[PDB]
Structures are given as C-alpha cells and as structure tokens.
Design a protein around this nucleic acid. Structure first.
Lengths: 120, 120
RNA sequence: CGUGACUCU
RNA sequence: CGUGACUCU
C-alpha cells in the first residue's frame, strides 16, 4: 500500500499529534524531512483515478499557503487547490514537495501525496 | 497473469496442436490474428527482469526466419535472437509482432511475448 | 522490473 | 489508473 507523505513525515520528525500543533515546521525539521523525502516517488490522491506519479526533487521552504508559481501572473498553491479542485488544504502551514524538472515549478501539498512502493 | 501471445493466437485461430504442425500461418490466419493482437500491449520475456512493454502496431507477413531490419547492413530476426540472446527460436516459421513507431522497425518474435493485462 | 514524460504547478 | 518513451529491432 501507499503511505501518506504526511504520515511518513510524522515518523521522520517523531511527531504523533500532527493535528494538535498547527505550527509550521522548523528549519531543522524541514531539513531532516527533505533528506528523507527527496528522491522518493509519490502518487497524487486528489484526481480520482488519475494517480499521477512524480519524483520528489526537493521540499519548499515556504508553506503551501505562500509558495508561489507562474500561473497563466502568479498564484499561491493553497488558492490553486481551492480554486481548481475546490480543496481547502488541511495543512496550509506545512510545505509543498517540489517535483519533476526543477525549472518547471511543480509544487504538491503534502496532503495529496502518497509514497509509492516499488515493485521489484 | 500475462498470457503468452502464442496461446492467445492458438485461441484466436482455434489451434490446439500448435507444435504438431510446424506449418506457417495462412494469409487468412495472419489476418484474423492481426485484427486481435493489433492495439494490445505486450511485455517481453527474454530479458530477465527487464520486461519491457511494447504496443503492438501490426503483424509481419514474413516469418521470424526471414523478417529483416536495418542492423548496425540488415539482419534476419531469427539470427539476431540467436546471436544477441543465443536463443534458437522455437517458432521461426510464425511471424513477428511489429511494435512501437512504425518507422523504427522493431520486430518481436511471438515466443518472447506475453499479453499484458490492464489494471484499472 | 527500473527510469524519465503528459493529462501539471 | 490511462498513454507515449529508453535500456530496441
């Protein structure tokens, strides 16, 4: 089965009450989490059966609530997911996973992400 | 599970003794088989764990023993599989499945082919 | 199987 | 999930 990246994170950062503290990650927490999530493959979970797979290439420093990209202007990913998918993010304070070609600015909220299990 | 294309063929052509008659397919048999195999996805079975998947785009008229392509000159696929994989084909008389971009000449002996099952 | 790509962000 | 691509032929 696929493990929610949120859960993967809580295991990495040794968090149990993820929803108890709506506090942002510290630089120390972001750095430890990035080392672990970078390089892994994730599958999206907000597009029904179109579970697109991405390669995590980095973690943003800014939270989903502020991370921005070139929108055709520039938009905040939280809005985008509430405007294009009508999804009020549950963790706008946590960062997004940057995926795909660096020079492409694809940011994915942790919420909609599951770690894909390899199948050798 | 993946079904050998040989088996798929015998079902299409209503053949039971595939190995009893080492006779080539008739134009009628080739045409009926092509209608069914064209468009299907197959996975290769002669490269260990590298089960590459191809899209069947057509069936050759010439048998594996004669079908040719631009080899870097031109070679017969039977030889190629006996020279590059040291695989004396079991059915050099049956045709090959052409796969991928038409203008690329990729021919696959039926032997090394399994029909890939979709996973909706 | 592994990788990279699109329907993205 | 679907598609198309490479390690092909």
């Amino acid at each position: 089965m696929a493990q929610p990246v949120i859960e993967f994170m809580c295991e990495v950062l040794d968090i149990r009450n993820i929803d108890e503290q709506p506090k942002p990650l510290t630089d120390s927490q972001r750095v430890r989490f990035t080392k672990e999530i970078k390089g892994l493959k994730v599958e999206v979970t907000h597009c029904g059966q179109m579970k697109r797979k991405y390669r995590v290439c980095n973690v943003t420093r800014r939270p989903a609530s502020h991370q921005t990209f070139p929108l055709q202007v520039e938009c905040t990913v939280a809005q985008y997911f509430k405007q294009k998918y009508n999804l009020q993010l549950k963790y706008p304070h946590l960062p997004c996973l940057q995926v795909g070609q660096e020079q492409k600015h694809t940011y994915l909220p942790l919420e909609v992400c599951n770690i894909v299990a390899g199948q050798r």
